[PDB]
Amino acid sequence: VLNVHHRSPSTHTMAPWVKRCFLHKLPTFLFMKRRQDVQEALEGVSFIAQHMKNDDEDQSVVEDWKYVAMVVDR
Amino acid sequence: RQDVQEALEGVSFIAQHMKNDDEDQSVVEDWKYVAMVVDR
Amino acid sequence: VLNVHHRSPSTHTMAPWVKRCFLHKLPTFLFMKRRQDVQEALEGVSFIAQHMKNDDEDQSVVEDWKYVAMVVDR
Amino acid sequence: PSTSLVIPLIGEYLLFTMIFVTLSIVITVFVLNVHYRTPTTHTMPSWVKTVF
Amino acid sequence: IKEAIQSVKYIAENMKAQNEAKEIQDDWKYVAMVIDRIFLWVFTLVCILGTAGLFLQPLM
Numbered sequence: 001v002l003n004v005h006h007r008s009p010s011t012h013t014m015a016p017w018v019k020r021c022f023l024h025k026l027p028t029f030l031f032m033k034r035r036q037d038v039q040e041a042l043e044g045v046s047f048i049a050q051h052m053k054n055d056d057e058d059q060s061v062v063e064d065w066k067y068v069a070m071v072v073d074r
Numbered sequence: 075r076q077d078v079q080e081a082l083e084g085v086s087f088i089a090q091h092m093k094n095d096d097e098d099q100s101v102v103e104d105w106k107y108v109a110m111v112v113d114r
Numbered sequence: 115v116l117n118v119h120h121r122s123p124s125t126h127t128m129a130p131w132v133k134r135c136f137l138h139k140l141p142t143f144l145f146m147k148r149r150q151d152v153q154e155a156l157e158g159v160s161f162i163a164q165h166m167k168n169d170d171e172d173q174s175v176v177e178d179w180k181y182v183a184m185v186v187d188r
Numbered sequence: 189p190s191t192s193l194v195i196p197l198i199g200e201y202l203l204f205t206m207i208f209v210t211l212s213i214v215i216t217v218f219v220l221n222v223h224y225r226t227p228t229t230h231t232m233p234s235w236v237k238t239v240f
Numbered sequence: 241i242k243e244a245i246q247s248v249k250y251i252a253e254n255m256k257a258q259n260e261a262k263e264i265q266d267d268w269k270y271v272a273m274v275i276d277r278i279f280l281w282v283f284t285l286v287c288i289l290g291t292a293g294l295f296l297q298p299l300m
């Protein structure tokens with residue numbers, strides 16, 4: 001249960017059965033309940049927004065792995 | 075114009091947030107140096 | 115060798131003798147080889163970029179301390 | 189006893205397990221050195237891109 | 241005026257370089273995970289073979 005705490009999206013990928021089992025059934029079963037210079041600037045700001053959105057997605061998946069390890073621990 | 079106004083407020087909020095973050099980092103480095111002095 | 119790994123730029127100053135000894139000669143000797151609303155927005159973006167530049171410089175210096183620790187260890 | 193005629197199976201098993209657990213720690217220090225490694229200190233080779 | 245736009249360009253280049261360095265560090269972590277798995281399988285087979293051939297089998 002310590003190994004499933006440190007899984008990241010850059011190494012592993014969450015299977016759909018461990019998606020649907022360790023997040024919905026057992027937490028409700030174990031009482032958890034959860035002009036030219038201006039053009040490059042828009043491209044840079046769009047790249048910054050894409051990078052922050054990807055970072056938030058990876059952080060959400062690693063928090064999901066932490067909660068799965070917590071459920072198996074309980 | 076109403077869409078333009080909130081972006082400047084966002085940039086000013088980011089600047090104030092990073093300034094408060096730098097002040098907190100300076101204070102925690104001060105605590106680390108106090109620990110170093112007491113240890114020596 | 116564990117004290118010299120955790121030396122930060124804010125609390126220590128890297129002397130020139132460890133510069134000339136443990137960074138150049140020994141990594142070759144040991145086969146290491148390495149408008150008042152508008153104007154403040156521009157000033158804020160300039161401050162953010164200059165602070166990221168300072169952060170990059172301090173990160174380079176702390177990685178240099180880590181490399182000195184690695185050379186002493188080998 | 190200290191009879192050097194034959195060795196017990198349990199003492200042989202203890203020596204066997206000690207040899208392989210010592211080889212396990214000399215492997216785990218190598219994998220800890222491989223893990224904590226950055227591009228600002230090491231260059232990654234070409235044959236490790238295909239094999240490992 | 242242009243200095244702010246060049247600063248945004250600098251921020252974008254800094255974030256791209258930090259992303260690429262994190263990619264290299266993830267590769268260094270993954271090769272260690274591979275070495276870890278291959279020695280797990282090797283020592284599991286050696287441990288089962290040793291406890292079979294040296295502990296139960298003559299002693300029966």
Ligand SMILES: CCCCCCCCC
Pocket residue numbers: 048088159248251
């Ligand atoms: C133009 C605003 C850019 C803000 C960058 C903040 C980066 C936080 C990691």
